[PDB]
């Protein structure tokens, strides 16, 4: 969900 993670 977080666009900066994975």
């Amino acid at each position, epitope marked *: 969900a*977080n*666009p*900066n*993670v*994975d």
Partner: antibody
Amino acid sequence: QVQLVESGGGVVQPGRSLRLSCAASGFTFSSYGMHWVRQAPGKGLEWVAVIWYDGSNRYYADSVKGRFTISRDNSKNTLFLQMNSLRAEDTAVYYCHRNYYDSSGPFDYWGQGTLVTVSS
Amino acid sequence: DIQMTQSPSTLSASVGDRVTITCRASQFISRWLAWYQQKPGKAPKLLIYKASSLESGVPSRFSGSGSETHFTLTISSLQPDDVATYYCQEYTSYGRTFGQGTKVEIKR
């Protein structure tokens, strides 16, 4: 190694526009985003703007959204910030910045900063 | 617009003291909270990410805690080289928001 090199600082008269640039090397801008972050004389860090690798998801801080435009030129590996209607509050060191997290770990990069002074 | 509020604004203590900074987020941010260290005339350096994970090479006296809206950064034994300004930062979405910063100073 990833390197970010900012350019464009110096003195600029109020009301004018200025374009800063950040030449990136060591990676292709094909994932995540890139940011501008600024810091006025002895004040705190202020995130200014972001753009995604595909040119989308452009967002700005409220204080600057009405006057700034972020863009990128991948064929040059270069990030831009265009600041319009320059005013006293824009005097600051401007950093380009890249940050993301993946299974190899955190990745956090900053340019050296370039100082914009708005003055006659 | 998410607001990040750190406290205290300045923190003066002695070498060896345990010191803690708080950060409060005006919305739920899970654990997407980072902590940066900045020394004068330098670019900031990431110290802690996902609220409690340390960057490699960050000394073990640093630690972070919290979730959702209340977060802390602790230095368990303040050392001379820790004098710096410390910023919390949310990264829930495309942009970023920094706290106002905490200047850590040493009394000797």
